[PDB]
Amino acid sequence: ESQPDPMPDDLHKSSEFTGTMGNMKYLYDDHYVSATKVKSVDKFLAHDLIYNISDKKLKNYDKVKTELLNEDLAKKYKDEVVDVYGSNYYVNCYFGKTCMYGGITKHEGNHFDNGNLQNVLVRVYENKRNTISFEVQTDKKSVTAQELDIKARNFLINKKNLYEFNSSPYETGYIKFIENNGNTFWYDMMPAPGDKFDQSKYLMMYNDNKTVDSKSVKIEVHLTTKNG
Numbered sequence: 001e002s003q004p005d006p007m008p009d010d011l012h013k014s015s016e017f018t019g020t021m022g023n024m025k026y027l028y029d030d031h032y033v034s035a036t037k038v039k040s041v042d043k044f045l046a047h048d049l050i051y052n053i054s055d056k057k058l059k060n061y062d063k064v065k066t067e068l069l070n071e072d073l074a075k076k077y078k079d080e081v082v083d084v085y086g087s088n089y090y091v092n093c094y095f096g097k098t099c100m101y102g103g104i105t106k107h108e109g110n111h112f113d114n115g116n117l118q119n120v121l122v123r124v125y126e127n128k129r130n131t132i133s134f135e136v137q138t139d140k141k142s143v144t145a146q147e148l149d150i151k152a153r154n155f156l157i158n159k160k161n162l163y164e165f166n167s168s169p170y171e172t173g174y175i176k177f178i179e180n181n182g183n184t185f186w187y188d189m190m191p192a193p194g195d196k197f198d199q200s201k202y203l204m205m206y207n208d209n210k211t212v213d214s215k216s217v218k219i220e221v222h223l224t225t226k227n228g
């Protein structure tokens, strides 16, 4: 069964976050771990996998630990040739090391043919009006929801100032995934109330390694603006 859509009090309010909105912005603004045809090299806890992945660009890490929801997932992927996509953090990361959640898909059989890319449609709703729509791309057949989530938020940060250093133009936001079997789920896009932001804790939602069919999945982003 589907996750029921948000109740009014399910959704975090950015007005109730008095920490730094930049710490959320940072997780999604041109920010991801990406690795291809890798195989885990080690483990810390029972539910995690460590990989030798170096960031090209700014050269900040060469090992990545991904935590999974349970031990069965770790065992399932441990010796598989995988591709990795996700949002990394350094604060309270403990095994040039960085930490993330989920992001795992088997490589073999998971790509479209002629170097093809699959376009996935994101409809954006602002105070319930579909104001803009845009496409994100993946070359994966079964893609993590996290990868599509990161791609969509990166675009909304840049095009819609979704997150800014001090705050956000939006009060609440969730990203909803609609699958072709009718299953739906959603992530809260705002930080928990209070004055600190816990990145390890926020990102932990991706631990389930949730995958969707890229060719068929529908995405909705539902935002509410501040005054009314």
Ligand SMILES: [Zn+2]
Pocket: 036, 037, 082, 083, 106, 107, 108, 110, 111
């Ligand atoms: Zn691959």
